[model samples]
Target: FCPGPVTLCSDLESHSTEAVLGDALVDFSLKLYHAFSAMKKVETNMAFSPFSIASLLTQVLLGAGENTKTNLESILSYPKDFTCVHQALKGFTTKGVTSVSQIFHSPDLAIRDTFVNASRTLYSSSPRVLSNNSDANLELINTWVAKNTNNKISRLLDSLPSDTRLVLLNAIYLSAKWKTTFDPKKTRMEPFHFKNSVIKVPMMNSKKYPVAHFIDQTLKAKVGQLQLSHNLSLVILVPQNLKHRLEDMEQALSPSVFKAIMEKLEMSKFQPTLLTLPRIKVTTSQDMLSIMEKLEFFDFSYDLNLCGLTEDPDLQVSAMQHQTVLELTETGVEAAAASAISVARTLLVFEVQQPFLFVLWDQQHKFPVFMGRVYDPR
Candidate 1:
């Protein structure tokens, strides 16, 4: 039911193709996600800056597709907006040859038209980022996916549909920046902390950063991370000064870095002071499965009831679900867009008093499902 040039169609087809390869949609979901992850790896492997991967998967459990190809071909018809992905990868252009075809099939006429029209409409009219160096790549992708999935996902969906079996969605975004910017003058050698001792490490520095602050317990929690969308967040943890070696902070800032930092942080101690943090930005996507699973909403992709919307037999959903991933890099940021099929679940527009713009998207339809704006960083 997606309209236009078929870029939306192409994306849909990509989802459908992966769905048919496995028995349970969840199985397919994991496979597809890992596969996309591999794509990121390959990009990095080829010396091409890694590109963020954002994707959504949805299908009426019953009355899904007449056949696998019909479903897959449907999704593939849309020409994905690779602008963010491409821009991010551009930094590595001189390092290696990019194998673009491995990412997805060449788009068709419908895909091209849809992509072009959608880009013009969204970029020109939708809420966009206003901050210096504030890239809207993730915002655009998130909005696109949201428009496609009708915003069933707050951030992104990681798993497929549940037992109800209605529709499924997923998204992913990833990015990485040099711990230090390219400028040599801003970089300095410092003593970083290690588990047992300290070591000298090259550290990046920046002055007077507009950071988030919170006073909790005895420690002050500064803006260690930022949430780009409901599903994706960015975080950077650093020592008090450049004196702390990067390796010294490694174990302290591992996978659970945020939580650990939050627990140890004393918000009351947070004081605005001149600070220089290592230039670090990481993008990550979460599968709502764990969150949903904790809610006792088990049977994710396997749930038969999740096929709630399908009324026809020939087009059985055969599956319904959601999934998501994230990517971040120096050149730009990219995210799997979200789904916003339902009007009730439309995007929330935030007032920007500072300089900022936000865009919501529905990639499947290649349209802006909803959008909000705010200029004030406050």
Candidate 2:
């Protein structure tokens, strides 16, 4: 098993393409923007670390959903030019997911297959290719990371594909620990607040280090607690004044609120104090239908005529579906996500809880993907 949320695939073929890939991409982008924008508005943090194929697959699946378009891009090459394949994948996503799949452009099919197969083999007990496959496997992993990250990340895969054109991959990871490590010595089974009153809860407490921030108590906008990391940061939120539950928080979060919170944060150093937190682990598998319904996304489907793609809309998709899995832990976070158009996925993990946020971000782009709350750190 792949632990938290996992997707396993034996293999598959490429998707059908439409003439106007441009309109298809635009439609896909708009839907994605809307979907994520809705998530951003909720009180809960929903971080997404999508992969290269995942990004492309997302467009394809979305187009397929609307039935009017198939956003697949195909490039036939002579003499097997690996570099061209490199450019095509890079052009798909924002700088993040492109870097991981860089090596799939190599002239070697074995190398390409190795890279594509890593997602299924990551947690497999059976041997993948034999003892001599080490070099190729490394290149496959490296290329996958590079392509997904748009070259911003490299060296993740250590092998190479000599000849190849298509590949698929997806995974996501997350890790978070309380800023103030709970002390077992003072640990007392107390009551946790559950809307009406307080129920008994084993709340964790500590005093060495604690993160701090200001919340505009007057406004509906709730400022999130920050966990900084050299500019790229994570913010955690649990609704304002216990007015909402975790489900409510998840539904109410949005990117605009994230932007507002970041703009309002005022950095200041505070002395070490005591703090208390809950230790919880939540694992969930969300189908596209369930998530979309909760987020209130309707009217877009795989069989609908996509007037957005072209005038003569003979070209249409049959069906579109997605499977998403998310995991959060104390060390870092990991995820494995996919869609029916062609499975796409990504994985992300990093340290958190410190003066890392304000210290890392340069005033601008301080939006937080995760947020948290605290009562008092004595």
Most accurate candidate by TM-score:
2
lDDT of 1 by residue, 1-378 (tens): 322222233444444433122112222222233333343322111111111111222221111223332333233221222222111122212111111110011111011233334433322221122222213333433455666434533444233322221223333222222222233465565544344455554444433222234422212212343333222223333333334432333223322333334334323232222333332322234333443333333443333231122222222222222332222222223322333443443322111111111112211222111111111111
- Write model 2 residue lDDT over 122-195, tens digit each, in one string: 32211123223446655655554556444434443223332222223333223223323344566556555554
In order, the Cα lDDT scores of the candidates are: 0.27, 0.31
| Residue 113's lDDT in candidate 1 | 31
Q: Give the backbone clash total of model 1.
A: 133
RMSD (CA, angstroms), candidate 1: 19.4
- C-alpha TM-scores of all predictions: 0.29, 0.41
How many residue pairs of model 2 clash at the backbone?
A: 84
Model 2: weakest 10-residue lDDT segment is: 74-83
